[PDB]
Amino acid sequence: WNDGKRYLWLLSPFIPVLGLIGLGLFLYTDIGLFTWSGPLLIYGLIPLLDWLVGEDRNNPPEAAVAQLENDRYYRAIVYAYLPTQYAVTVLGTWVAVTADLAIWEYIGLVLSVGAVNGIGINTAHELGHKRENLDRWLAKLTLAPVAYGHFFVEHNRGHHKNVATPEDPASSKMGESFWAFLPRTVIGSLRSAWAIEKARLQRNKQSVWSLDNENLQAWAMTIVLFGALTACLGWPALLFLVLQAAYGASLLEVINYIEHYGLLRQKLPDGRYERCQPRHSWNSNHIVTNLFLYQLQRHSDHHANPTRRFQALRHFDDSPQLPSGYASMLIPAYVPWLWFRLMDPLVARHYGGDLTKANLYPPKRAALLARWHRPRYQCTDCGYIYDEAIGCPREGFPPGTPWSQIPDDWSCPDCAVRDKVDFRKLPA
Ligand SMILES: CCCCCCCCCCCC
Ligand SMILES: [Fe+3]
Ligand SMILES: [Fe+3]
Ligand SMILES: [Fe+3]
C-alpha cells in the first residue's frame, strides 16, 4: 500500500525556509512588502489553496499501520524543522536591530518571526508526546524561542486530562469571545503547570525550587538565548524578541480556542468524568492545511490516543466537523459576532437542539437557552507497563512498591488519559 502523500509532508518543514527566503529577498531587493511574508502566507495564501482543494476522508489500512510507525523518514521530517527556526530568529533580530526600517515593516518582521515560532510551537507539541528521552529535550529546546516553555508540562499532563470540562483553562465555552478567553487560558496554564510540578516534586520528597523542576529547565533555555542575543546586539533585540514571542503565544492560543469550542464531557454514574472520545473535539479534513501542519486538524484521534504518530491518524464519522480549515478561520475568530454566527448553529445542530449538554458561558447562559434550546499492570491505551520490581522512580515510587500503595488518582505517565482503576492486571 503506497502512502501517496509521502513526500508532500515536506511542506511542513518548509515554512521556516519560506520565512528565510522572504528575509533574503527583503535584504537583497530592498522592498518593504517582502517583510510581510508570514502574515500574507498564513492569512491569504493558505486559505485560498484550502478553497481550491477540498476534503479528503481517507484512512490508512489497518495492516499498513504497523509499518507506518517504524519509518525513520517520518521522524527526520520533524527533526528537520529545528535547524532553521533558530536561523530565522537570529536573522530577524539582526535585521530588526541593524537595518533602517519603517514602523509598518517592523511590525511585519515581528509578525513573520512570531508566525515561524508559532509553527515551531506546533512542532514542539508533536515532539513532546513521544516517550523517547531525546525527543522531550528536543521539544524543550524547540519551545525556547517563543518563551512559553511550560507548555511541555501543561499540555501533556493538564490539558489531555481535563479535556472539555468546566475546569480546564484550555477549553472554550460557547458564547465566550476570544479576547475574554486569552487571559483566562494564559493564567490558568501558568498556575496549572506550577501546581503540577510542585505536586510531583513534593511527592518525590524534594523542594520545588530544585534543578529537577521541568518548568525551570524549560525557562533556562529561553533565558540563555535571550541573554546571548541581547549581549551580542543590545536592548532592542530583547524588545523585538519579547514582541515576537507574544505574537507566537497568541497564535497558539487561538488554535486552542478553536479546537474544543462548546463541547463537554458527561459525568459517569460515579464521581468522575467519562473517558475522552472522538466526539469531544472539532475535526476537519482539508488537505493543504493538513500538509502544511503535521496532520494537526485531525484533533480527535490524536486527542483520544495521544501516542499515535501524526502519519497514522484517522478520520472518525462521529466527530463534529468544522466549516473549513484552521487557517481559513482565523480572521472569523478575532471578530466575535462573526465567529458566533458561524459556530453557534453548528454546536446546536451537533447536540440535536438540546443545549443542556454543552459548555455554556455562565454570564450568557439564559440568552443561549432562550434562543437555541428547542428539544504487573498495563495501560489499556498506550500499552505502558508498570512493574512492582521496577517501579516508577520519576513519580516518587521507589523500586519494590506494591500496587496497593499507588494513589487512586494516579494516571498513566505516557498518556495521562487513564487512571489507576482503568489498568489491566497482566498474568504471570
Ligand atoms: C494543541 C496543539 C498546538 C497546535 C499549535 C499550532 C499553533 C500554530 C498554528 C498556526 C496555524 C495558522
Ligand atoms: Fe486539544
Ligand atoms: Fe496533544
Ligand atoms: Fe497510558
Side-chain angles (χ1 to χ4, degrees):
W1 172 79
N2 189 359
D3 173 77
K5 296 194 300 182
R6 198 188 142 83
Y7 303 108
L8 279 153
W9 296 118
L10 285 171
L11 298 195
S12 307
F14 190 81
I15 284 177
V17 179
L18 273 183
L20 211 47
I21 293 300
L23 271 190
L25 289 175
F26 169 62
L27 268 183
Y28 182 74
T29 70
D30 192 359
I31 289 173
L33 276 297
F34 279 118
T35 54
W36 295 68
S37 164
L40 289 192
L41 163 79
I42 78 166
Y43 286 150
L45 199 79
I46 295 309
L48 191 146
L49 278 299
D50 265 346
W51 184 40
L52 262 69
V53 178
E55 296 292 329
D56 167 43
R57 301 184 167 194
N58 267 325
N59 288 341
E62 294 294 328
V65 174
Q67 64 180 20
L68 293 175
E69 290 205 81
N70 289 324
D71 214 329
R72 292 282 169 289
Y73 157 74
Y74 293 110
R75 303 214 295 272
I77 295 170
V78 189
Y79 287 154
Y81 192 101
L82 296 202
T84 304
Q85 170 187 4
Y86 282 87
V88 162
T89 302
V90 166
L91 267 295
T93 310
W94 182 72
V95 169
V97 303
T98 288
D100 289 345
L101 295 175
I103 294 174
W104 56 277
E105 55 192 359
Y106 187 68
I107 296 182
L109 261 186
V110 160
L111 263 66
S112 177
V113 183
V116 174
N117 292 331
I119 294 89
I121 282 186
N122 165 42
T123 299
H125 161 266
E126 195 278 332
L127 266 187
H129 280 294
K130 279 73 177 175
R131 69 187 69 86
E132 296 293 329
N133 196 3
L134 170 61
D135 301 8
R136 274 89 178 282
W137 283 104
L138 277 191
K140 290 184 185 93
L141 192 69
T142 304
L143 286 162
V146 70
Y148 183 76
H150 53 281
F151 170 85
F152 164 75
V153 164
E154 159 69 12
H155 178 95
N156 282 38
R157 291 202 295 241
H159 170 72
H160 270 269
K161 186 167 147 284
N162 302 320
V163 189
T165 50
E167 293 84 4
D168 183 29
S171 313
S172 301
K173 300 173 189 290
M174 154 156 75
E176 203 181 29
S177 66
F178 179 49
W179 315 112
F181 170 84
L182 191 48
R184 180 175 81 101
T185 175
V186 170
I187 295 170
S189 290
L190 276 160
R191 304 293 181 89
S192 181
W194 194 250
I196 284 156
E197 208 62 22
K198 184 171 77 174
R200 186 184 79 82
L201 285 201
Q202 280 183 358
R203 179 144 34 79
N204 211 354
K205 279 78 177 173
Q206 192 172 2
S207 174
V208 60
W209 290 108
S210 161
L211 301 189
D212 296 355
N213 200 305
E214 293 179 353
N215 302 332
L216 303 191
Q217 279 175 18
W219 292 336
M221 288 150 185
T222 296
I223 289 296
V224 161
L225 184 136
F226 280 25
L229 284 198
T230 316
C232 290
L233 285 173
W235 306 113
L238 180 57
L239 167 60
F240 172 76
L241 291 163
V242 161
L243 290 172
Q244 65 97 28
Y247 179 66
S250 167
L251 263 172
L252 163 62
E253 296 298 330
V254 63
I255 301 301
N256 262 2
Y257 184 73
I258 291 172
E259 291 184 355
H260 314 271
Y261 175 85
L263 313 176
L264 177 72
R265 265 162 58 191
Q266 272 291 340
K267 279 187 179 291
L268 281 184
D270 54 352
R272 55 199 295 259
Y273 284 92
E274 66 182 353
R275 315 319 312 157
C276 169
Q277 293 185 5
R279 71 161 159 285
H280 297 107
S281 68
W282 291 93
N283 174 40
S284 69
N285 322 307
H286 272 248
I287 296 176
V288 171
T289 312
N290 285 19
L291 260 54
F292 270 96
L293 309 174
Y294 299 92
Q295 196 83 49
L296 180 64
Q297 285 77 19
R298 283 192 180 173
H299 198 80
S300 301
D301 213 352
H302 153 63
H303 208 262
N305 312 265
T307 47
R308 224 167 180 81
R309 284 182 174 175
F310 78 100
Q311 79 259 20
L313 291 188
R314 290 176 315 252
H315 154 75
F316 278 126
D317 277 4
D318 205 3
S319 46
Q321 316 284 341
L322 287 172
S324 294
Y326 284 3
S328 167
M329 60 184 72
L330 279 172
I331 295 93
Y334 304 135
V335 194
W337 56 268
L338 187 59
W339 167 263
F340 288 164
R341 165 193 294 281
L342 276 156
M343 290 297 104
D344 289 348
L346 291 176
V347 170
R349 185 158 75 65
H350 165 50
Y351 280 135
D354 184 5
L355 293 177
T356 57
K357 308 179 185 296
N359 208 0
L360 305 189
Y361 199 38
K364 210 179 290 184
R365 197 147 196 281
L368 306 182
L369 292 175
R371 193 176 194 273
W372 288 107
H373 188 72
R374 323 287 187 236
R376 299 208 325 151
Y377 300 72
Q378 201 189 30
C379 166
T380 60
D381 196 300
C382 62
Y384 160 87
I385 288 187
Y386 173 91
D387 190 340
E388 292 177 350
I390 291 298
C392 204
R394 292 179 63 86
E395 289 279 344
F397 308 119
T401 299
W403 178 261
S404 71
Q405 278 73 12
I406 308 290
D408 282 329
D409 61 357
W410 188 75
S411 59
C412 173
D414 289 330
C415 64
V417 73
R418 296 297 202 275
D419 300 345
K420 173 184 179 289
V421 309
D422 298 319
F423 274 44
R424 170 168 82 259
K425 175 173 217 272
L426 285 176

